[PDB]
Scaffold this active site. Structure first.
Site, PDB file in Angstrom:
ATOM      1  N   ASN A  38     -51.611  -7.351   6.717  1.00 42.24           N
ATOM      2  CA  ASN A  38     -52.415  -8.381   6.077  1.00 42.24           C
ATOM      3  C   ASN A  38     -53.832  -7.997   5.666  1.00 42.24           C
ATOM      4  O   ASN A  38     -54.643  -7.549   6.487  1.00 42.24           O
ATOM      5  CB  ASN A  38     -52.442  -9.610   6.979  1.00 42.24           C
ATOM      6  CG  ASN A  38     -53.014 -10.804   6.294  1.00 42.24           C
ATOM      7  OD1 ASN A  38     -54.178 -11.146   6.482  1.00 42.24           O
ATOM      8  ND2 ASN A  38     -52.204 -11.442   5.483  1.00 42.24           N
TER       9      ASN A  38
ATOM     10  N   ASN B  13     -49.932 -15.026   0.398  1.00 47.16           N
ATOM     11  CA  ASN B  13     -49.961 -16.177   1.279  1.00 47.16           C
ATOM     12  C   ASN B  13     -50.900 -17.208   0.654  1.00 47.16           C
ATOM     13  O   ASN B  13     -52.125 -17.119   0.782  1.00 47.16           O
ATOM     14  CB  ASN B  13     -50.446 -15.750   2.672  1.00 47.16           C
ATOM     15  CG  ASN B  13     -49.515 -14.730   3.337  1.00 47.16           C
ATOM     16  OD1 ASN B  13     -48.315 -14.974   3.523  1.00 47.16           O
ATOM     17  ND2 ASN B  13     -50.068 -13.587   3.695  1.00 47.16           N
TER      18      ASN B  13
ATOM     19  N   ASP C 210     -53.713 -19.140   2.876  1.00 48.06           N
ATOM     20  CA  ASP C 210     -55.028 -18.597   3.215  1.00 48.06           C
ATOM     21  C   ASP C 210     -55.529 -17.573   2.210  1.00 48.06           C
ATOM     22  O   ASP C 210     -56.536 -16.904   2.443  1.00 48.06           O
ATOM     23  CB  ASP C 210     -55.038 -18.006   4.627  1.00 48.06           C
ATOM     24  CG  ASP C 210     -54.174 -16.760   4.763  1.00 48.06           C
ATOM     25  OD1 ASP C 210     -53.483 -16.355   3.797  1.00 48.06           O
ATOM     26  OD2 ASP C 210     -54.181 -16.192   5.870  1.00 48.06           O
TER      27      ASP C 210
ATOM     28  N   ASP D 148     -49.813  -9.535   2.221  1.00 45.21           N
ATOM     29  CA  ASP D 148     -49.198  -8.532   3.095  1.00 45.21           C
ATOM     30  C   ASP D 148     -48.761  -7.393   2.194  1.00 45.21           C
ATOM     31  O   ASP D 148     -48.054  -7.618   1.207  1.00 45.21           O
ATOM     32  CB  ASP D 148     -47.974  -9.105   3.791  1.00 45.21           C
ATOM     33  CG  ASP D 148     -48.302 -10.296   4.633  1.00 45.21           C
ATOM     34  OD1 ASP D 148     -49.376 -10.285   5.282  1.00 45.21           O
ATOM     35  OD2 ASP D 148     -47.497 -11.248   4.618  1.00 45.21           O
TER      36      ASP D 148
END
Length: 130
Positions: free
Chosen positions: A60, A46, A49, A53
Site C-alpha cells: 500500500n 482503494n 482512502d 496496492d
C-alpha cells in the site's frame, strides 16, 4: 509479469525470503498468490482512502511506497511505487522485508490472515525444489 508457482518460489528463495523474520517460503508464496496471483503489474485502487496496492505483494502506497497522489501518505520502503511494478521483484521483496520488520510481521497483510494463517500451506512450494 505473472510468475509460474515454482518459478516464483525459487526466485523468492534466492532473494533471501525463506525464513525471513521467521516466515517460511510457503507463507510468502501463499501471500503473493492471494494478493496478486503472482502478478507484478497488479494494482488496486482503494476509493475509500485514495491509496493503491502495487505489485506481487500488493503493498500500500499510503504507508510503504510513494506514488505522489496518495493523501497524507508516507514511504516506509523509500521507493517509488513504480519499483513495485517491475518484472524483477528484488525491490518488492526488499519492501516486503521492511514490512515484516514491524511487530505485525506477515500479519500486516489482512489477506494472509484470511487465506494463509493456520492452514496447511505446503502445496505452494511442493515440487519446486525449495
Amino acid at each position: 509479469k505473472v510468475f509460474e508457482r515454482c518459478e516464483l518460489a525459487r526466485t523468492l528463495k534466492r532473494l533471501g525470503m525463506d525464513g525471513y523474520r521467521g516466515i517460511s517460503l510457503a507463507n510468502w508464496m501463499c501471500l503473493a498468490k492471494w494478493e496478486s496471483g503472482y502478478n507484478t503489474r497488479a494494482t488496486n485502487y482503494n476509493a475509500g482512502d485514495r491509496s493503491t496496492d502495487y505489485g506481487i505483494f500488493q503493498i500500500n502506497s499510503r504507508y510503504w511506497c510513494n506514488d505522489g497522489k496518495t493523501p497524507g501518505a508516507v514511504n516506509a520502503c523509500h521507493l517509488s511505487c513504480s519499483a513495485l511494478l517491475q518484472d524483477n521483484i528484488a525491490d518488492a521483496v526488499a519492501c516486503a522485508k521492511r514490512v515484516v520488520r514491524d511487530p505485525q510481521g506477515i500479519r500486516a497483510w489482512l489477506a494472509w490472515r484470511n487465506r494463509c494463517q493456520n492452514r496447511d500451506v505446503r502445496q505452494y512450494v511442493q515440487g519446486c525444489g525449495v
